[PDB]
Design a protein around this ligand. Structure first.
Ligand SMILES: CC(C)(COP(=O)(O)OP(=O)(O)OC[C@H]1O[C@@H](n2cnc3c(N)ncnc32)[C@H](O)[C@@H]1OP(=O)(O)O)[C@@H](O)C(=O)NCCC(=O)NCCS
Ligand SMILES: Cc1[nH]c2ccccc2c1C(=O)CN1CCCC[C@H]1C
Length: 315
């Protein structure tokens, strides 16, 4: 059909991820599973600017770059259930390439991920989310990104990351459950030899014998930029790192000498301008303004169809 998820334009990344998920589902041979479609719907160039305190201490002194360029991508996963598309998973990532100044070079960071719990069958839902994330790490590792970063931050009560109006009975995991969920994902990646290893931020920083705040990757919207500004306004930083360590993952995709002899990162996919999916706010607002909800299967399917018409006919 004219405005289907499958007819959204393809990318190498979307294709790679959907082939992984569908091959997984085919091996499980569950009669209730439907075809999965994965589409990158936004990609654009951005920069994160170093905030005044760090800018005063380290940028002005020529010890650290003033800003760091990255590519933002938004991708969505859809499942066919009884001939109807359901959008059930979304993710926004920041990708810092090989031209980026240290300490941000060749890193990926997950800005947001969100879901609505209607994947059929339910006994495969978590496994499918893990397959998308492991496939993302698999892909960026293939391109030459060396490290992944994840802040396990659940949304505040009443706050939706990507999808407006979640089901009333979809529980939101607490930090501890969410940490264990990312670990289970990462252990599967480790056994597939995609992830070399992973550590909490304090352990990584300790084992790498990092001297200075300038050595820590500096990402848009992350915790650590704001904690650094607070630290500069008022040794304590080191105490914050340890207390909150368990919620920040540093994921090594490529370690050893092989991590230092890499060609440049060449992303084969074009930029994809799309107003609706540049950041999270725009899609939340359109849902709010069109009275869309993702609060039941049928409402989510209706909202998915509206989302798709919009994606197809913008510009
Ligand atoms: C992260 C996410 C995709 C994981 O989904 P998931 O694979 O279904 O895993 P969850 O931990 O949410 O749920 C698994 C089980 O734990 C349960 N659970 C979740 N939160 C719970 C809570 N606070 N108390 C008790 N049980 C809970 C669920 O009900 C579910 O039960 P089931 O397996 O019997 O159906 C999803 O929780 C989500 O969309 N969260 C909101 C966005 C977010 O947290 N983003 C992460 C960082 S950007
Ligand atoms: C707050 C914020 N502002 C941005 C502007 C542009 C791009 C990204 C962000 C962004 C995030 O990524 C936040 N995110 C970080 C990872 C955990 C979940 C959550 C707390």
């Amino acid at each position: 059909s004219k405005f289907s998820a499958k007819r959204l334009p393809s990318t190498r990344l979307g294709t790679f991820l959907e082939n992984r998920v569908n091959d997984f589902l085919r091996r499980q041979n569950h009669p209730e599973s439907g075809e999965v479609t994965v589409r990158v719907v936004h990609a654009s160039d951005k920069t994160v600017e170093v905030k005044p305190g760090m800018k005063a201490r380290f940028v002005d002194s020529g010890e650290m770059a003033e800003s760091f360029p990255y590519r933002t991508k938004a991708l969505f996963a859809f499942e066919e259930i009884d001939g109807v598309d359901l959008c059930f998973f979304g993710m926004h990532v920041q990708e810092y390439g090989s031209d980026c100044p240290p300490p941000n070079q060749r890193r990926v960071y997950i800005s947001y991920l969100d879901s609505v719990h209607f994947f059929r069958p339910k006994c495969l839902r978590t496994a499918v989310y893990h397959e998308i994330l492991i496939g993302y790490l698999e892909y960026v590792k293939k391109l030459g990104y060396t490290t992944g970063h994840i802040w396990a931050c659940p949304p505040s009560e009443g706050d939706d990351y990507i999808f407006h109006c979640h089901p009333p009975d979809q529980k939101i995991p607490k930090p501890k459950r969410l940490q264990e969920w990312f670990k289970k994902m990462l252990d599967k990646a480790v056994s597939e030899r995609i992830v070399h290893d992973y550590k909490d931020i304090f352990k990584q920083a300790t084992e790498d014998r990092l001297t200075s705040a300038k050595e820590l990757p500096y990402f848009e919207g992350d915790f650590w930029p704001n904690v650094l500004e607070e630290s500069i306004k008022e040794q304590k930083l080191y105490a914050t790192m340890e207390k909150h360590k368990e919620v920040f993952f540093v994921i090594r995709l490529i370690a050893g000498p092989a991590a230092n002899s890499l060609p440049p990162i060449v992303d084969p996919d074009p930029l994809i301008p799309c107003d609706l999916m540049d950041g999270r706010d725009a899609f939340l607002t359109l849902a709010r303004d069109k009275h869309l909800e993702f609060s039941s299967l049928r409402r989510a399917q209706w909202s998915t169809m509206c989302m798709l018409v919009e994606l197809h006919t913008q510009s």
